[PDB]
Amino acid sequence: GKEAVRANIAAVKAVEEALKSTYGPRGMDKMLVDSLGDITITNDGATILDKMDLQHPAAKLLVQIAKGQDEETADGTKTAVIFSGELVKKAEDLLYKDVHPTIIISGYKKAEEVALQTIQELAQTVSINDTDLLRKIAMTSLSSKAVAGAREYIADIVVKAVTQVAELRGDKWYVDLDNIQIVKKAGGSINDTQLVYGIVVDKEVVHPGMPKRLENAKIALIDASLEVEKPELDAEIRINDPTQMQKFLDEEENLIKEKVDKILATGANVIICQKGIDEVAQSYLAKKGVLAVRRAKKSDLEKLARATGGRVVSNIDEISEQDLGYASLIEERKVGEDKMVFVEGAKNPKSISILIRGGLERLVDETERALRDALGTVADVIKDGRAIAGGGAVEIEIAKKLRKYAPQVGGKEQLAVEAYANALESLVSILIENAGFDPIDLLMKLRSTHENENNKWYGIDLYAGQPVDMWQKGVIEPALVKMNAIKAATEAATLVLRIDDVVSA
Template sequence: EYRVDLDDIMVEKKPGGSITDTGLIEGIVLDKEVVHPGMPKRIEKARIALINCPLEVEKTEFDAKINIETPEQMEAFLREEENMLRSMVEKISSAGANVVICQKGIDDMAQHFLAKKGVLAVRRAKKSDMEKLSKATGGRIVTNLDGLSSEDLGYAELVEERKVGDDKMVFIEGCRNPRSVAILIRGGTERVVDEAERSIHDALCVVRDVVQEPKILAGGGAPELEVARVLRDYAESLPGREQLAVQKFAEAIEIVPITLGENAGLDPIDILSELRARHEKGERWAGVDVVGGKVENMERLEVYEPLAVKKQVIKSATEAATMILKIDDVIAAAKAKPPKTSGYGGVPPSY
């Protein structure tokens, strides 16, 4: 049994360009830029350190004052800070990393030392992005530089900063067997990008459902018509009010092909009549072809839907209808009255 976690798929939006520029990245894309102008903008065969600790001089947990009275003391103080930052960078370099993705901040001096080492660095990455990077690159997120080793590093064929629209983004591509990937959505306007995001999310949900429950059935309202036909035949065998309930359930299910026909600009009565007639003849694959604007064989057109989605739709609709039918009475809420005032402050009293 397969399980698909959509959280492992990063969907990043960036207005600009064409919708055809939207694509899958076998890795991760960060809406960040390289922190220092002296750093390389492109690293091939990247060895990536994922760090969840600040590359800064650690601040004390309590208030403290340092009295510096001479230039020598000031120089010694600054030198010690520099040595601490240099030590951090040396630990990263010794592990073999040439790319650093840091969840916290990176001090300006540390940026300078990293740039001199030829290391590409990104700071303040989101926690969710760090987790995806770990899955994509195979690296481990390190919270203490003292424990950083070559075994903790992730790998990617390419890490590169690119200009996307008006912004810069960092692409981590070519990961080995990535367990997390990214989709970068482009479009001419914000509205186009948002609509594309919704469509991609719907498509991903469909793929997830098919992978987790690999069963499909015809689309176009064909299953609903066939179920309605069988229910009507079954209703004939029931006595009294039960027969009416089953017949009404059959009518309710037929709303799916009716709605498809209306959305395609077709006459719903004509569509429903033709669908019923063809299903009575045994054409159980007959459904609404919204492109051709007529009733067609859905199997021949290869129009399918995941069984899991269809079951959930019918189940949810039935539960909602059942809940409403259980309501015995409706109590209208009374209009709220304004609070009584005493008449002070120039406000007339209310009774």
């Protein structure tokens, strides 16, 4: 009865009360002090709940359905949790009135139903040529990060980078995310970033006597070791005579000059590897006119493979010119505080790279997260095709539309739908609250300014503090992500109402 069900509800509400103040672009920071005293400050919804001490069975089940939802989305999963916790909360006033949860649930289902389709029958059609629109959507992802400065710059890259790679295959839009390389260097400004129309290898050219621009790249992706090490297949017995030592490693140095030559037997003129290159072999490749890089990360090997038509070879004695990576021009460029290798004019037209620059070593590190999500968010819009106005706009519609409906649902069920609806307006009240404005004033100013049918896209610009068309302010977002967010929230929410008791062994 009231006993255990209050615990479950409680726990959930408690977790919502942990994120509330971090909602939206006016959402503030939480600080996290590790058990070793290490400090981590953030507003990432996810992170605050993964790093959190969470032990109640009901809560752990809630976060599993909210967090692990259909699409990826920092602000939607944060929405899902908060909105879960409001759905659980608004139901408590109904239980006080002695309504059975079986009804409140069927009631939340009929509201959900309408809630889902109300975003579908309202969404606008977004495809490959709507590229000044995907720009807006981008800022809708980067504005909620804590990342500073020129996000318009990044919004613009992120867009070009997805539409380069997007492909329509059998009447379905696709994005192979892997055709986008991301390299990051600390220092410089976030305006000093760039889109590269080709591959960017993070590791530099080993020996400074080597060329730094080789014409007509025939790349040799070498997993093998091209650096000596102490005797291995040379003896099964221990070595103790310094005469035997000399004749082993001496022949072994002409063995690496042979292995490198066995690669130049194929026509290779650039050579990048996953293990060492001997310093004498650096002097050899320098005397040959070869551009070599030592110990590059397999993360960049795969991306360079399918850009230039190469593949990674491990058996030096099988390397062939079919393995080589053909590309128009390979170079090693310095861009600001650091340098790296560029592969412009590569075989694949889709394969591109991004160059991140923008403050200190950890500040730049979160700029790649922001870039990832930005890319994702534009691409999912292209992969689906539907995009709605943020700033609370679809919420106040789904709220209004449910309220006018509620009467036709029936008797007790009605209070369920009104409760669901009050919770939807509450969600946007939380975003408005965190801006520092009065919630209800603006909520009402919205429920008035949406009386016509051409005000569907109106919400509250937290910057202005007054009802505005969010579409016509560049704040648009992926329709389906914030549609599966509601689906997640309701699932979890009704699941906590479904539990009659908590038995523990």
